[PDB]
Write a protein that binds this ligand. Structure first.
Ligand code: MN
Ligand code: MN
Lengths: 195, 194
């Protein structure tokens, strides 16, 4: 069925002073909504090419599906990943963070560093690899969804995610976002990944 | 579901430019494998799409492009080769002269970019409908030619030449011109023009 823009789990000003209401409103109501609207159109075109047996046309639509579909997936996760009252990692997630990264401080530094280092637009991710049964960190370009591991916590480093507030100073945003990481949600995603 | 197209000639008909053993493996194993895998990948994709698993549907894209591109590219390729392909039509020769100077210049330029492909891929002569001009391009792996109409393709995956030419890819790329099916290429040009 048709994709829709999910409501935010909070009001647009609820993450201040870490992310402005200006940013939250544009990011959700314009940027995410555009991915949803475009995704619905691209899925319809792809379904048509598949049904008509137009293989070249189906292949040609793949970048648009990955871009808008990835945009929808990424931002849908990102909204649930943010909270004013995030809380603390679950006992099991904390244990696993300690096992895989030494400490929460180490994880935060390492993920912040690779996220800050993204050239152009993209995302940093904490994920869970089900095959190796370990936490891992990665970056993705543009809206490429995190693949091969289950996403737990994502940091959007497209310039639109921070520029109105932070201007060029991307590291201030990336370090600050940890203050609003929704550990309740991240812990739920971790529990789900290990089932 | 997709099927392996019959060759329009017998397996030894392109000798001495491309051997019987190459044609047999290239058609019956390599192209067949793309067809078989393409059919399986389409079914995995439909299940992902019908169940609403957008993430999995995106994850399956590289396999569709690779196997689907494999099927597309080789299906064109077989029609592009002939023991006695003739010469370009007058209209095609005129356009070749317009856009490249001469057939000699087009052959040199396309051979050069095709030889220069790093790893596996294809060289293409194509017709761009927007700008109404012939162009040359290369594609990586099995990526189909996009944004122009394919007219003549040169497979430079090592399996296309290795048994006969070994490491000497340039001798193969230069020699394939001897078996270019200009009857087919000229027809593809005429269709691209309308
Ligand atoms: Mn964004
Ligand atoms: Mn081949």
């Amino acid at each position: 069925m048709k994709h829709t823009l999910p409501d935010l789990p909070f009001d647009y000003a609820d993450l201040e002073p870490v992310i402005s209401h200006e940013i939250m409103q544009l990011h959700h109501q314009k940027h995410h909504a555009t991915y949803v609207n475009n995704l619905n159109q691209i899925e319809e075109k792809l379904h048509e090419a598949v049904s008509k047996g137009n293989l070249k046309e189906a292949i040609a639509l793949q970048p648009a599906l990955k871009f808008n579909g990835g945009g929808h997936i990424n931002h849908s996760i990102f909204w649930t990943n943010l909270a004013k009252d995030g809380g603390e990692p679950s006992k099991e997630l904390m244990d696993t963070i300690k096992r895989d990264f030494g400490s929460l401080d180490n994880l935060q530094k390492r993920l912040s560093d690779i996220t800050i280092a993204v050239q152009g637009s993209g995302w940093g991710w904490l994920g869970y690899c089900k095959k190796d049964k370990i936490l891992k960190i990665a970056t993705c370009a543009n809206q490429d969804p995190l693949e091969g591991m289950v996403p737990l916590f994502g940091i959007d480093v497209w310039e639109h995610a921070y520029y109105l507030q932070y201007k060029n100073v991307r590291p201030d945003y990336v370090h600050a976002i940890w203050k609003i990481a929704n550990w309740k949600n991240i812990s739920e995603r971790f529990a789900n990944a290990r089932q």
